[PDB]
Nucleic acid binder design. Structure first.
Lengths: 54, 97, 78, 101, 101, 81, 54
DNA sequence: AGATCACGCGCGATATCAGAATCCCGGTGCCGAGGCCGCTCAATTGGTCGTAGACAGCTCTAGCACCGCTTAAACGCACGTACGCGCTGTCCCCCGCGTTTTAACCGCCAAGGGGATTACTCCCTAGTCTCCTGGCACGAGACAGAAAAAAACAACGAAAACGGCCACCACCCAGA
DNA sequence: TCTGGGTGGTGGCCGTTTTCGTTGTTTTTTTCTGTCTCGTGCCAGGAGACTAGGGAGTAATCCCCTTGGCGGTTAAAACGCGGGGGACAGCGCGTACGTGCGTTTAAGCGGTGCTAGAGCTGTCTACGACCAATTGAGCGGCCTCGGCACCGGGATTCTGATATCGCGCGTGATCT
């Protein structure tokens, strides 16, 4: 999954961001690493609907 | 032997035939009444049939009430005092040997 | 020193959290919450370093302290 | 005549949300947070030294915790039919999490 | 010409709150919960037997979890300036707790 | 065994809510609570049956349930362990 | 604390309710057993202020 | 016309007339707890040997500290707009009470699956000596990616045009 | 012929669409640098081969308790009616964050110095595992009894309405 994310980012080397994307996007891995914080991982881009402009 | 294609109910046919505005509906219905002067006494009754979908006939409650014994059924099975109260599934399908 | 956690920094943290509008008082509340969290984590870390008879707090002490509280951290020799 | 291009309030907020959810760098300046960590520690033990990696780990954990807390706070505010997060939102998020009594 | 003694809505609710926070006996009926437990277990292994103590432990755990969830739900409902708990309140409580994704 | 989740009647959920300090309950709350309870029981009984199978037993003992709850982070006192 | 609670109820014997009251009414003990369920413990009687009549 | 007094209406508080639910007081039977007895298994006493940990010396890595520039970021200030919050009204959803029905609960009986234990035996795992090759540390080299500058493009905000709705005028039809 | 109603055309206002320029961001090509990946060498952990012991597999027995079922009682769940209080949609205000520009602060980076303590090594001792003997503390079981659960009767709030009484406001009558 991390290499998939790296390809989507046009990068040939996996960085912590790609690991975070792979873990959080996948439901089962995210459930496994539920109480884990990945250094330099950031978060998934997610904005609540009501906050978007009309 | 369905007509197939697209079929409209009387209500939607009237909706597209009237455009939902009141002035055109007036120009149509007043003309209908005028052309039906021989039976003007029944004019609007005749007029309003076209805009109604078919409906099964059922006695209005002001005639059934005259007879307390009678009572409607689940889907119109018109019952009397002589009809036994239906049994439940608990009383038939669950009763032991 | 706790005021070193500036208003713009809390704004950035809220934004990364998806927050669009932030009340005026949120900054002091966030400073208090961060202070409590750091107090817990640093207390556990310093306990670990004392038990090891060390005057230096190593990243492993912090990682163990976080793991204690159910906040496992990856990327520092866990 | 002349008029500035002021973005409608709430637009730069969305741009910043997008910018900061797309990045990974730490959002608190290193040196002030390091000073805060040292001050908090000096309560528990005097003349303490910190590995640079130790302070970095503390910062990463703290920032991740605060970001998750702000996510829950934003959810709480939206639940209240609001758009602004207010201290009662943080308090409810912490109370439901089980952090605050 | 007399009117019965109807308590104003919300009075008997408060009396029930006091009564059920004062007591400790299980609130879910035992046989229905046992049947539910067996039905749920039937999807993991067939021809399973349950110690009565096992079903009682499951019931205690479930009731405690539901009571805590309802406490959090009431907190969220009050946070929204409401008095009635609604499914959105339960969803927010679970989401903040970390149970629901 | 079919349709036993409805065995968690509306009044039972009302009592559970009251013990939780709830004064007014929406009508839709009962189905949501039944769903939540089903999820919780599924999560617990899964681990309980896993423990039972590992012990090569056909009977789920209270200690299996206690171990499952402790695993999930809901330690339960009063049934051994 | 459990014996104090039992005395408050004019009861010679400690029952799980008294243990629950003792644990939950004490800040430190309740923090120690924060993630613990006491069978037959019940809950601490408390009603939110807004729910009371005026 | 203004002020004072009396009467009527409206609102608040207390009482009350009740009746409803809870708590309390007493008697009673119970079964759950506390206690005594006997048996045995696990803890204590005594001794050994071996390695784990304590302690001293040395090394050098990393932490601390200091300085000085530069410049990104914080701080501050102001305008305003849009979001929070209060008030209000409406509708219906939910609480409350009451018959009516359902099935939970208790208790009692019958059956046996499977938990629990015991005894036998062996096959698997610990342990140890000798062998070696996989994994680690160190060095190196080069290309993936950071950066950066410039262009392209892709989201944000004003006046004209088109379309829709409302108002007014003109024309046609119907009624007086 | 005049007035009213309805239709058609024209004009005005509002909403929507587009239409445009402006920042902000993304994409693209060039540069260059430092960390990823590969190689070399040594060593220490894994492998191989072998012995010993006991943990666990397996069979047999048994005795609990889990399942099933059945009937009686009645407590609880259901269904319904009714009403009111709460959700929520709307409106209006006001003010408090947001956006942006200017000024100020100090974070950050690069550089050099110093030494504190973390790590490693060698040595030694004493603490703990291991073993054997034994006896006494803890556990199972049984009995007695009394703390508390049950049930009935009584006291006590107490919740909601109405009404009475008191106080306040408004209207009417009388006096100045």
């Amino acid at each position: 999954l991390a290499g998939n994310a790296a390809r989507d980012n046009k990068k040939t080397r996996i960085i912590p961001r790609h690991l975070q994307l792979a873990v959080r996007n996948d439901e089962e891995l995210n459930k496994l690493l539920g109480r884990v914080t990945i250094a330099q991982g950031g978060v998934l881009p997610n904005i609540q609907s009501v906050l978007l402009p009309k | 032997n369905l007509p197939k294609g697209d079929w409209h109910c009387n209500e939607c046919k009237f909706k597209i035939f009237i455009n939902n505005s009141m002035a055109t509906l007036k120009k149509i219905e007043s003309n209908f009444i005028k052309q039906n002067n021989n039976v003007k006494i029944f004019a609007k009754l005749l007029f309003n049939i076209d805009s109604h979908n078919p409906k099964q006939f059922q006695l209005p409650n002001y005639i059934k009430e005259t007879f307390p014994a009678v009572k409607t059924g689940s889907r119109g099975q018109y019952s009397d005092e002589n009809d036994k109260i239906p049994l439940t599934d608990r009383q038939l399908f669950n009763t032991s040997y | 020193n706790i005021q070193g956690i500036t208003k713009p920094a809390i704004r950035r943290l809220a934004r990364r959290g998806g927050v669009k509008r932030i009340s005026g008082l949120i900054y002091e509340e966030t400073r208090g919450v961060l202070k409590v969290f750091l107090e817990n984590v640093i207390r556990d870390a310093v306990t670990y370093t004392e038990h090891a008879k060390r005057k230096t707090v190593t990243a492993m002490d912090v990682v163990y302290a976080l793991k204690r509280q159910g906040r496992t951290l990856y990327g520092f020799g866990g | 005549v002349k008029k500035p291009h002021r973005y409608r309030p709430g637009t730069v907020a969305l741009r910043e949300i997008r910018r900061y959810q797309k990045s990974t760098e730490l959002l608190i300046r290193k040196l002030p947070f390091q000073r805060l960590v040292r001050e908090i520690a000096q309560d528990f033990k005097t003349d303490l030294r910190f590995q640079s990696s130790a302070v970095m780990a503390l910062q990463e954990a703290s920032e991740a915790y605060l970001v998750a807390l702000f996510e829950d706070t934003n959810l709480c505010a939206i639940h209240a039919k609001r758009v602004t997060i207010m201290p009662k939102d943080i308090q409810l998020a912490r109370r439901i999490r089980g952090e605050r009594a």
